[PDB]
């Protein structure tokens, strides 16, 4: 969690392993796909709310109607200032939530592994675990997916 990855692809959140069966990055499709749904629904909501169907053709007034021009000018300027503020505030506010949203997902995934990966694996802090039992691909994918066989292994306990 302390430092991102570059070799990994096809997923925002993924695992890693160094077992003799083979070393290589992997992605959590279930976790990544769920995050995409919120992003797609979040970006769509912004577009839908910001309607744009209206008439914006400008008008002109003669010299004796200076009051009309100043009043008409204020109406145009007023709305542009409001929309500019609204557009930035919504975009800026939503970005912060999205950045925090990912942190919860990755952190939540890390805790989920901890629950499924009981004390048999030693935690070294830097987003990694050390196993007290030798495990092959069959067991490695058990931790990656939603099925684990904790009672089978009780080495060093």
């Amino acid at each position, epitope marked *: 969690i302390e430092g991102g990855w570059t070799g990994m692809v096809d997923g925002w959140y993924g695992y890693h392993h160094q077992n003799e069966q083979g070393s290589g990055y992997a992605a959590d499709q279930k976790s990544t796909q769920n995050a*995409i749904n919120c992003i797609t629904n979040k970006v769509n909501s912004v577009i839908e709310k910001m309607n744009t169907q209206f008439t914006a053709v400008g008008k002109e007034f003669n010299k004796l109607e200076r009051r009309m021009e100043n009043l008409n000018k204020k109406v145009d300027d007023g709305f542009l200032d409001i929309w500019t503020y609204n557009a930035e505030l919504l975009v800026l506010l939503e970005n912060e939530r999205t950045l925090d949203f990912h942190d919860s997902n990755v952190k939540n995934l890390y805790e989920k592994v901890k629950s499924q990966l009981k004390n048999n694996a030693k935690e070294i802090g830097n987003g990694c675990f050390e196993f007290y039992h030798k495990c092959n691909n069959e067991c490695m994918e058990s931790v990656k997916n939603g099925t684990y066989d904790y009672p089978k292994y009780s080495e060093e306990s």
Partner: nanobody
Amino acid sequence: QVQLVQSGAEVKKPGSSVKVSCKASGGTFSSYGISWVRQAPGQGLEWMGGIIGMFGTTNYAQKFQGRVTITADEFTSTAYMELSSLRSEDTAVYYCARGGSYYVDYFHHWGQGTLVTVSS
């Protein structure tokens, strides 16, 4: 409910490039994976390649590996084609497919397809 729509049928001279655009009804921002498949006349289908969600990772079969390029404008929910070096064997039907997830897994949404033929 969603609908997949492709461009109209086209005919191209041999040795040219043909582009087909795939779009989804109500094509707002989308991240579903896309791919393509060829159905030669009277023969079975064969995969071509596809995109992977936001990451935009492309994989193509080794049969050509240089002749087909796919890029998707996710904002408009559109997938394009840049097939080049058409030949007589290439006369077949191209279909647009979606997998329902950002990955390139199995497909369960299809468009109406497009028939492209090559001749002088």
